[PDB]
């Protein structure tokens, strides 16, 4: 019969109502800058399909970040470019400053306005309680904006959040896996990093939506308030779901599978068994209790749900009492 179809609870038809040029990234005509404006200085890091360099813009002495794009599927270069251009100027979105080509290899490279090479993962084990709530709220601003623009990031994790802690500014980066949401579309489940994969990716449910990013955000939050990194620490994609079921319980896992008529891969059958839901208080101890409150546990509980439709949206999340102090102090 097939799996039951699903629709985003929010921003369902934003791309349908856009001019086709907005989301038809394969037809996008790239505006190329001048590679001679920039001099690479040193390598900052490496992705599986990218090389990242610190560089200087010699025309104005500004430091920038240069990302060399090299996906196997050429289609993904225009996808990342078109998403970055559609999102440019939105809150806490990294700003694409230029697009050039390596003069030797002719490989496309993105030029970003500089942010300090310090990600949320290097910082979030030394933050106070208030700073976790502040930066979580800033990430939610970025996610609600990109969701409202029809885009799911699909790779939300601490290494993709750059923070300038001195200036308390935050940028959500690496839009190389981001996609446009279209109702009824079946997407690739081989996205995101293992520890942050939502249950829909692990049980192979393809008609997912923005709510995938909200599961990943819940995984980051649990890691921070509990000082456990990663919070769900599987050895492969099958064990990853087992790690989740040992916390959220198996009853709601199978209710989820029943609801969408999902065919569970037989590799799961021998390793899941039965698990009761563990109350979130079971993870509190003396070295993390200063980060844990009733509002944090209630908020966490509403992000980490098997059923993607039951998870808080980014907008609903920003109204949670967990952020009441941040919202008051912000005005």
């Amino acid at each position: 019969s097939g799996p039951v179809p699903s629709r985003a609870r929010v921003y369902t038809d934003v791309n349908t109502h856009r001019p086709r040029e907005y989301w038809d990234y394969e037809s996008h005509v790239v505006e190329w800058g001048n590679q001679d404006d920039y001099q690479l200085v040193r390598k900052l890091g490496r992705g599986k399909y990218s090389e990242v360099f610190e560089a200087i813009n010699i025309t104005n002495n500004e430091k920038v970040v240069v990302k060399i794009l090299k996906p196997v599927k050429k289609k993904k270069i225009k996808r990342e470019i078109k998403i970055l251009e559609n999102l440019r100027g939105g809150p806490n979105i990294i700003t694409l400053a230029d697009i050039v080509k390596d003069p030797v290899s002719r490989t496309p490279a993105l030029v970003f306005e500089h942010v300090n090479n310090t990600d949320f993962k290097q910082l979030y084990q030394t933050l106070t309680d208030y700073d976790i709530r502040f930066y979580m709220y800033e990430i939610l601003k970025a996610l609600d904006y990109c969701h409202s623009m029809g885009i799911m990031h699909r790779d939300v994790k601490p290494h993709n959040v750059m923070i300038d802690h001195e200036h308390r500014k935050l940028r959500l980066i690496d839009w190389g896996l981001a996609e446009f949401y279209h109702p009824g579309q079946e997407y690739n489940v081989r996205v995101a990093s293992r520890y942050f994969k939502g249950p829909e990716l692990l049980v192979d449910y393809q008609m997912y939506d923005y709510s995938l990013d909200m599961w990943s955000l819940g995984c980051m939050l649990a890691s921070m308030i509990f000082r456990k990194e990663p919070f769900f620490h599987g050895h492969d994609n099958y064990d990853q779901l087992v790690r989740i079921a040992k916390v959220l319980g198996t009853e709601d896992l199978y209710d989820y599978i029943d609801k969408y008529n999902i065919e569970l891969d037989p590799r799961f059958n021998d390793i899941l068994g039965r698990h009761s839901r563990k109350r979130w208080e079971r993870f509190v101890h003396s070295e993390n209790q200063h980060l844990v409150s009733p509002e944090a546990l209630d908020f966490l509980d509403k992000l980490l749900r098997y059923d993607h439709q039951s998870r808080l949206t980014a907008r609903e999340a920003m109204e949670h009492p967990y952020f009441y102090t941040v919202v008051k102090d912000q005005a």
């Binding site: 001048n34 590679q35 001679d36 404006d37 920039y38 001099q39 690479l40 560089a55 010699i58 240069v66 050039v100 390596d102 003069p103 030797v104």
Partner: peptide
């Protein structure tokens, strides 16, 4: 490398 090297 854009500007030499």
């Amino acid at each position: 490398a854009x500007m030499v090297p």
